Design a protein around this ligand. Structure first.
Ligand SMILES: *[C@@H]1O[C@H](CO)[C@@H](O[C@@H]2O[C@H](CO)[C@@H](O[C@@H]3O[C@H](CO)[C@@H](O)[C@H](O)[C@@H]3O)[C@H](O)[C@H]2NC(C)=O)[C@H](O)[C@H]1NC(C)=O
Ligand SMILES: *[C@@H]1O[C@H](CO)[C@@H](O[C@@H]2O[C@H](CO)[C@@H](O[C@@H]3O[C@H](CO)[C@@H](O)[C@H](O)[C@@H]3O)[C@H](O)[C@H]2NC(C)=O)[C@H](O)[C@H]1NC(C)=O
Ligand SMILES: *[C@@H]1O[C@H](CO)[C@@H](O[C@@H]2O[C@H](CO)[C@@H](O)[C@H](O)[C@H]2NC(C)=O)[C@H](O)[C@H]1NC(C)=O
Ligand SMILES: *[C@@H]1O[C@H](CO)[C@@H](O)[C@H](O)[C@H]1NC(C)=O
Lengths: 225, 214, 93, 201, 50
């Protein structure tokens, strides 16, 4: 029916312009209105503003009315948001949403965008540091073993890890990102694999640091001191 | 402008249970409210609208009622597919305003947690920083707590805790608490241990490897 | 200025063709099916009583072939025959 | 010598020739290709049927309309006042209901759905479903409908009888379908006209 | 036996076909009459207004 693809740089220098685009698939862009919506993680979310997806007549939330500038294109089936003089706090996840044609009506945000993270680049952008973690005797359950893969020293967020390029999914838990005392971000995506497969297969954790365009199919192997 | 109040601010119950989440308003708005389902780490989906008129794509079990200021969502039967942060949104007045968001979980499947300490890899020893983390695979109530006692001292509180939310498998947690040191500071001591205090059982199991184990 | 009210009806981005008497082809919002063309692919019990020869024709079962004779004093709603069944004790016409 | 007497009863019992295994499910109608729901009014799986099996036809697909006439209006926007809404020109983007009101006032441009007329719309459609859905005839003992050998004259006539029935039903169903499709399309736009008149009147 | 079985088929065939056939005939005319009546109401209505 209607699907959206959110696009843009998940990093941006402080006090700079934010440029985002979201895609449409199915329906006709001319026949609806579209808005954007902001959510920092684990707090309240907020409506940004909407535009005439048909004509271009617009509105914005009063708070972001001067700061936020939303746009459209009839040509490419797309639409943009341009935000100036960003804050360090403005770091959030964004969305593209389908709104009702009526200026005042119900059933708003009927469909939502996939969600793209937007982190202000407080520190210099850098590559992920992929830290394998060998299963031991003290990290193996009777029925399972704890293979680990830490992405440390990575800036900015996020980093999405594939396991065997997503061949195994059972008991794969991506632990949330961590602010260390280093001022640097890190996390592991732990995989639970049966204890029977220990010392047999050399598994791979695959790093997808999308803005850095990094792929690290780094293995985890036991070594002796 | 017009604050949206959400009640109860937190809730839980078991499989096949009916729960009610109530929304309040600063000014009574005539049946102009929306409810939303937000899978954690996923794109929030629309649940209901216009004082809960029935909507296609949302199975019948989700229902509500609207009466000016008195707005309630009801989960008729609690499935595991129903853990999320539910939001009541007002479109009666502009600008739009949102529900606070209630972390709802399932009170079910209390389980014994599986303890998983993580070794310093060789890249880690070469990195100059040693992170000693410990994973508890499956505990329903979060009663389980983490501590670190090296042979010398107590290194608890120097750990950066990361707990996974409730899963599709189980409305349980998985916590890995990252105690990162420098190589200089980590090397000084000898015997390393992960200790686990689960208030659900009150039985601490200490997991140790001595110097030499690699 | 001057207000304008303007009426109309809903449509769907994606519709389906339907055969009528007015026009052999037309596009409407939501279609359905009137012909079930698909099977599960097995004779399923509830709610009727079934009985499978599994090697015996009903005549063969009514007469007595020692192999597959269990059908003696057995009742049914619908008896089924397998195309792999045959007389294998004594011929008859 | 008969070693006794076989007790004869009279019942819905019959025979059927197939090579599909016995399984565990809840469904009445049972065919050589297997158990199907008896829910919709027609099927094209097999002539041979048993129980509350929907009537066999020759057609592949006979689609039935359940909504009003779709007018996709994918044209370059003319920036017209409101949306220039018409009974002819379509209105993409109105999930709530089947009929709605679009207004262009001083305050801005807006839409509101009706419930009254659209409820009566869907209601009449839902009946039309039920009058054609779930309704069935039960047939308990047919004559054989496949012939491994050609005995001759008798066999020839029931092949005739079979083809007679299927042909008649096929055409009969074909008309039924088409007549209702028209009826629905009529009823939908007539209710559009009725709402149209209500406003103007 | 077999012969009788087929006439029973022939019989049920006819009755079923006719039954449905009649059912439609009836319903189609009912609609037609109701249409024609109120249409003539509409026609008289128009005559006045015109
Ligand atoms: C129902 O009909 C089928 C087909 O006529 C029967 O299957 C066949 O039956 C014979 C025994 O009557 C099988 O012989 C057996 O062979 C196996 C090895 O394949 C051997 O382990 C046994 O000791 C025995 O000699 C024959 O193989 C089998 N055909 C197959 C499966 O390919 C079936 O037995 C009939 N049901 C009855 C009489 O219970
Ligand atoms: C379900 O199974 C039946 C078979 O019991 C399918 O009906 C048709 O049956 C004939 C056999 O009687 C199929 O084979 C053909 O036989 C003729 C001679 O009778 C021969 O000239 C052909 O070369 C062919 O081998 C036939 O393929 C089959 N299908 C059709 C459409 O005629 C019935 O189609 C099956 N239903 C499904 C797939 O839903
Ligand atoms: C289109 O109308 C159909 C009516 O058949 C709706 O389909 C429902 O769901 C199944 C599978 O499509 C059907 O077997 C039922 O008959 C329908 N439900 C009931 C009990 O009425 C469908 O909801 C409609 N589609 C949309 C999204 O407009
Ligand atoms: C409807 O779906 C068909 C088949 O996928 C596609 O070819 C057609 O372009 C679609 N139309 C619209 C308006 O999306």
């Amino acid at each position: 029916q209607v699907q959206l693809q959110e696009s843009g740089p998940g990093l941006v220098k402080p006090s700079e312009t934010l440029s985002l685009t979201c895609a449409v698939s199915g329906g006709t862009f001319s026949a609806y209105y579209w808005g954007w919506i902001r959510q920092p993680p684990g707090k309240g979310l907020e409506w940004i503003g909407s535009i005439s997806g048909g004509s271009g007549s617009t509105d914005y939330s009063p708070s972001l009315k001067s700061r936020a500038t939303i746009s459209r294109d009839t040509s490419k089936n797309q639409f943009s948001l341009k935000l100036t003089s960003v804050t360090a706090a403005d770091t959030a996840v964004y969305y593209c949403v389908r709104k009702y044609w009526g200026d005042y009506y119900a059933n708003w945000f009927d469909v939502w965008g996939p969600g793209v993270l937007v982190t202000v680049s407080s520190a210099s952008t850098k590559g992920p540091s992929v830290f394998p973690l060998a299963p031991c005797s003290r990290s193996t359950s009777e029925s399972t073993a704890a293979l680990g893969c830490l992405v440390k020293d990575y800036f900015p967020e996020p980093v999405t890890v594939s396991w065997n390029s997503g061949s195994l999914t059972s008991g794969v838990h991506t632990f949330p990102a961590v602010l260390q005392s280093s001022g640097l971000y890190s996390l592991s995506s732990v995989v639970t694999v049966p204890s029977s497969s220990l010392g047999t297969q050399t598994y791979v954790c695959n790093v997808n640091h999308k803005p850095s365009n990094t792929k690290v199919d780094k293995r985890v192997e036991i070594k002796t001191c | 402008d017009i604050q949206m109040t959400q009640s109860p601010s937190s809730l839980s119950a078991s499989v096949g249970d009916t729960v009610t989440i109530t929304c309040r308003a600063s000014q009574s708005i005539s049946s102009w409210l929306a409810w939303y389902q937000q899978k954690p780490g996923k794109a929030p989906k629309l649940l209901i609208y216009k004082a809960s008129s029935l909507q296609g794509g949302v199975p019948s079990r989700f229902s509500g009622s609207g009466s000016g200021s008195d707005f309630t969502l009801t989960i008729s039967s609690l499935q595991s597919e129903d853990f999320a942060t539910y939001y009541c949104q007002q479109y009666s007045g502009r600008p739009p305003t949102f529900g606070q968001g209630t972390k709802v979980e399932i009170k079910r499947a209390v389980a014994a947690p599986s303890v998983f300490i993580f070794p310093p890899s060789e890249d880690q020893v070469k990195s100059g920083t040693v992170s000693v983390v410990c994973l508890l695979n499956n505990f329903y109530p979060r009663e389980a707590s983490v501590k670190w006692k090296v042979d010398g001292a107590l290194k608890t509180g120097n750990s950066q805790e990361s707990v996974t939310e409730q899963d599709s498998k189980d409305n349980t947690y998985s916590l890995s608490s990252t105690l990162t040191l420098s190589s200089t500071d980590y090397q000084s001591h000898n015997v390393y241990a992960c200790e686990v205090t689960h208030q659900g059982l009150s039985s601490p199991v200490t997991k140790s490897f001595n110097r030499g184990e690699c | 200025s001057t207000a304008t009210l303007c009426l109309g009806h809903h449509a769907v981005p994606n519709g389906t063709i339907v055969k009528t008497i007015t026009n052999d082809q037309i596009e409407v919002t939501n279609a359905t099916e009137l012909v079930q063309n698909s099977s599960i692919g097995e004779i399923c019990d509830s709610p009727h009583q079934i009985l499978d020869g599994e090697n015996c024709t009903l005549i063969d079962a009514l007469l007595g072939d020692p192999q597959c004779d269990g059908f003696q004093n057995k009742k049914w709603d619908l008896f089924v025959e397998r195309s792999k069944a045959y007389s294998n004790c004594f011929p008859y016409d | 010598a008969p070693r006794g007497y076989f007790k004869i009863r009279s019942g819905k019992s019959s025979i059927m020739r197939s090579d599909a295994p016995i399984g565990k499910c809840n469904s009445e109608c049972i065919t050589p290709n297997g158990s199907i729901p008896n829910d919709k009014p027609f099927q094209n799986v097999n002539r041979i049927t048993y129980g509350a099996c929907p009537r066999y036809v020759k057609q592949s697909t006979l689609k039935l309309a359940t909504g009003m006439r779709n007018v996709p209006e994918k044209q370059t926007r003319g920036i017209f006042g409101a949306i220039a809404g018409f009974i002819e020109n379509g209105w993409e983007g109105m999930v709530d209901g089947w009929y709605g009101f679009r207004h262009q006032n001083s305050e801005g441009r807006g839409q509101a759905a009706d419930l009254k007329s659209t409820q009566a719309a869907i209601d009449q459609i839902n009946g039309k479903l039920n009058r054609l859905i779930g309704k069935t005839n039960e047939k308990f003992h047919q004559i054989e409908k496949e012939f491994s050998e050609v005995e001759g004259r008798i066999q020839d006539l029931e092949k005739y009888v079979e083809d007679t029935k299927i042909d008649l039903w096929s055409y009969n169903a074909e008309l039924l379908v088409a007549l209702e499709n028209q009826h629905t399309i009529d009823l939908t736009d007539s209710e559009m006209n009725k709402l149209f008149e209500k406003t103007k009147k």
